[PDB]
Amino acid sequence: HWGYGKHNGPEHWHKDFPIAKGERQSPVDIDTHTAKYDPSLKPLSVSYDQATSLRILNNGHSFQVTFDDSQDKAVLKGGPLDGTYRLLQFHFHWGSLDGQGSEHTVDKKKYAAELHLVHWNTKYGDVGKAVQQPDGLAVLGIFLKVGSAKPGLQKVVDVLDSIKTEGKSADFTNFDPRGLLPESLDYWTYPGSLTTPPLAECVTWIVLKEPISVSSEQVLKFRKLNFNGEGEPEELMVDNWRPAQPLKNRQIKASFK
Numbered sequence: 169h170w171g172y173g174k175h176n177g178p179e180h181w182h183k184d185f186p187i188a189k190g191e192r193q194s195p196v197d198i199d200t201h202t203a204k205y206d207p208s209l210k211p212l213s214v215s216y217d218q219a220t221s222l223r224i225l226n227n228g229h230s231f232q233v234t235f236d237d238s239q240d241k242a243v244l245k246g247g248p249l250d251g252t253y254r255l256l257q258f259h260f261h262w263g264s265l266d267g268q269g270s271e272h273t274v275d276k277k278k279y280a281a282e283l284h285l286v287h288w289n290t291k292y293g294d295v296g297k298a299v300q301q302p303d304g305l306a307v308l309g310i311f312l313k314v315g316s317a318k319p320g321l322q323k324v325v326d327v328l329d330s331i332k333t334e335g336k337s338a339d340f341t342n343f344d345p346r347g348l349l350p351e352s353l354d355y356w357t358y359p360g361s362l363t364t365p366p367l368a369e370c371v372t373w374i375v376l377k378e379p380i381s382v383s384s385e386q387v388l389k390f391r392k393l394n395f396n397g398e399g400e401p402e403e404l405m406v407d408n409w410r411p412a413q414p415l416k417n418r419q420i421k422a423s424f425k
């Protein structure tokens with residue numbers, strides 16, 4: 169089964185998921201010399217005020233926080249998107265050291281981590297039908313750099329000790345994802361894929377220009393998680409990122425000049 173190690177990592181994934189070698193795979197490097205401003209892009213509309221978090225869990229490849237997506241509580245709208253996209257979950261990708269961890273890169277620069285806020289297109293009814301559609305999902309990607317502490321992340325960090333190993337989960341209600349956003353909503357966008365199996369090409373990616381700053385204290389707590397379940401041999405969850413994939417025939421557009 170898949171992971172990020174030598175024997176099951178991203179170089180192996182195409183054997184079970186041949187779309188790994190597809191025409192619109194994610195992540196990509198964002199070259200600011202060729203990711204051109206497009207004046208037709210609209211401002212991004214983030215409506216998370218009624219977001220209802222449910223649980224936080226270690227699934228053996230990251231930790232994710234889940235939400236109640238049964239109504240239009242927390243939705244992503246505007247930007248490059250047509251229609252309305254409900255927030256399903258968020259999770260992160262991070263490194264074995266501050267110098268790497270992000271999935272997207274900017275002019276080949278790797279950030280310490282990357283946050284993925286995952287949304288699905290409500291015109292398809294549920295997410296299982298949305299993932300079969302080229303416009304089924306919208307993932308809001310936010311880079312993390314090491315600096316001052318991000319107060320909106322602290323509730324997450326303070327609970328990670330309770331989900332150290334794969335399969336553990338915890339109650340995680342009343343978490344406000346507005347606390348994970350940077351100041352600016354300037355973004356890049358391109359059509360792409362899930363960055364983990366099944367790597368489906370169903371994602372409109374929206375990557376924010378401005379990283380959020382998290383403290384070294386905070387990101388170190390990510391690196392205490394385990395890929396393995398309890399009683400299994402410890403394998404620390406670090407470097408759980410897929411490297412940049414070829415942009416091929418795609419365009420990346422910027423909402424800003």
Ligand SMILES: NS(=O)(=O)c1ccc(NS(=O)(=O)CCNC(=O)Nc2ccccc2)cc1
Pocket residue numbers: 257284286295296299307361362363364365366
């Ligand atoms: N790293 S990333 O590119 O942002 C990313 C984001 C999400 C995923 N995986 S996912 O499961 O959440 C996809 C959405 N959920 C489903 O399709 N669920 C489903 C499917 C069939 C039946 C019933 C439910 C992987 C990578």
Ligand SMILES: [Zn+2]
Pocket residue numbers: 259260261284363
């Ligand atoms: Zn992700």
